[PDB]
């Protein structure tokens, strides 16, 4: 997919700062939620990342659950050039 | 077409054979006895059991019967 690099930057940076996406299956919608970009290339970008081996996908009731695996974290950190001591929001020990 | 299938007949037979001194001729007293001395799950089955128990009691009172 041909994604302008700034919208792809938004996608990658959001996926990193928290770690998960839902991405309703309905294409052609104007804006994906909490991303302010088109849902279509959100879905396609996470599909490409999964094909890489960085995002585990899970389709159920059209809501494309996305989760970031460790090599995904490393790849995003190298791409986002953010310091190597910050982890996505999932890794935070928000336990019981 | 009321035939009172296996369960009620066997239960009433055991009821008579284990509790004849306490059983009576009356349906309501034997109904309370069935409630107290046996754990019948529903209440329609309890009523059928008490009714057949009363019938068997009446037959026994008339005379000695098989089984």
């Amino acid at each position: 997919m041909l994604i302008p690099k700034e919208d792809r930057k938004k996608i990658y940076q959001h996926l990193f700062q928290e770690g998960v996406l839902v991405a309703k299956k309905d294409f052609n919608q104007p804006k994906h939620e909490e991303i302010d970009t088109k849902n279509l290339f959100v879905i396609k970008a996470l599909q490409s990342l999964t094909s890489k081996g960085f995002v585990k996908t899970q389709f159920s009731w059209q809501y494309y659950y996305y989760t970031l695996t460790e090599e995904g974290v490393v790849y995003l950190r190298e791409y986002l050039n953010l310091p190597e001591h910050i982890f996505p929001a999932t890794y935070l020990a928000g336990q019981s | 077409g009321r035939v009172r299938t296996k369960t009620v007949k066997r239960a009433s037979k055991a009821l008579i054979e284990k509790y004849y001194p306490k059983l009576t001729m009356d349906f309501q007293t034997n109904k309370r006895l069935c409630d107290e001395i046996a754990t019948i799950q529903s209440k329609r089955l309890r009523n059928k059991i008490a009714g057949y128990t009363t019938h068997l009691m009446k037959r026994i009172q008339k005379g000695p019967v098989r089984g």
């Binding site: 928290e18 770690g19 998960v20 996406l21 839902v22 909490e34 899970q58 389709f59 159920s60 009731w61 809501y63 659950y65 989760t67 970031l68 929001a89 999932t90 890794y91 935070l92 020990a93 928000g94 336990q95 019981s96 | 369960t7 066997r10 239960a11 055991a14 009821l15 284990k18 509790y19 306490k22 001395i37 046996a38 754990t39 019948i40 799950q41 529903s42 089955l45 059991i49």
Partner: protein
């Protein structure tokens, strides 16, 4: 959030269906059994009953965490207002869902169909169940379809005893030549079935009478009078 109460309950039910199917998709490798949705004044607790609880939690307790995040975005919840909880199944033998998933996994590894089915039945009856049954339908080593039936104990079929005691589970297994359909039925022990009836509808229990001695004819035994 204002909405009709009947519509609110329907939405709650469809949300529970949401959660159950999503967890079935995700935690299938975990021997998923069931999910409970408890609603408090502040938190929407979601208890997960699964076999591999420690793997469900994951390292440092992050897996559950990210799962929670998905829910918070699946239903537009708020942080803190929702929280997951992973619990071990009370007895993995009795839950037909877990057995169905486990023996689907066994089928996935090319294990013998008859051997896997009989092992499942044996384990279930070992758990204390009053009867188990498994239907394996599909292309069992032949082009023509056929259904194999394995059973032991007794399985009722009519009346809500079918709902009160026997629990069923249906699964699909993907092989290199087609799909196999798997149906698992377990009739739990009614005596141990809490929160409901504790016996079959026609199960009649008669209390054994106590034996007493009557011979004492006069027996005017006197207590000390009180006033």
């Amino acid at each position: 959030a204002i909405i009709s109460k009947k519509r609110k309950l329907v939405a709650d039910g469809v949300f529970y269906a949401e959660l159950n199917e999503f967890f079935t998709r995700e935690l299938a490798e975990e021997g998923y059994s069931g999910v409970e949705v408890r609603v408090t004044p502040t938190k929407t607790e979601i208890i997960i009953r699964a076999t591999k609880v420690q793997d469900v939690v994951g390292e440092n307790g992050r897996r559950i965490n990210e799962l929670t995040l998905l829910i918070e975005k699946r239903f537009k919840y708020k942080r803190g207002t929702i929280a997951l909880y992973a619990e071990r199944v009370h007895d993995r033998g009795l839950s037909a869902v877990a057995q169905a998933e486990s023996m689907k996994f066994k089928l996935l590894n090319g294990l013998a169909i008859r051997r896997a089915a009989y092992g499942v039945v044996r384990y279930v009856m070992e758990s204390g169940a009053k009867g188990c049954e498994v239907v394996i339908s599909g292309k069992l080593r032949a082009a023509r379809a056929k259904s194999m039936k394995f059973a032991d104990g007794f399985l009722i079929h009519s009346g809500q005893p079918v709902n009160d005691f026997i629990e069923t589970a249906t699964r699909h297994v993907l092989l290199r030549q087609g799909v196999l359909g798997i149906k698992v039925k377990i009739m739990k022990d009614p005596s141990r079935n809490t929160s409901g009836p504790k016996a079959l509808p026609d199960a009649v229990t008669i209390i054994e009478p106590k034996e007493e001695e009557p011979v004492l004819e006069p027996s005017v035994k006197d207590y000390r009078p009180t006033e």
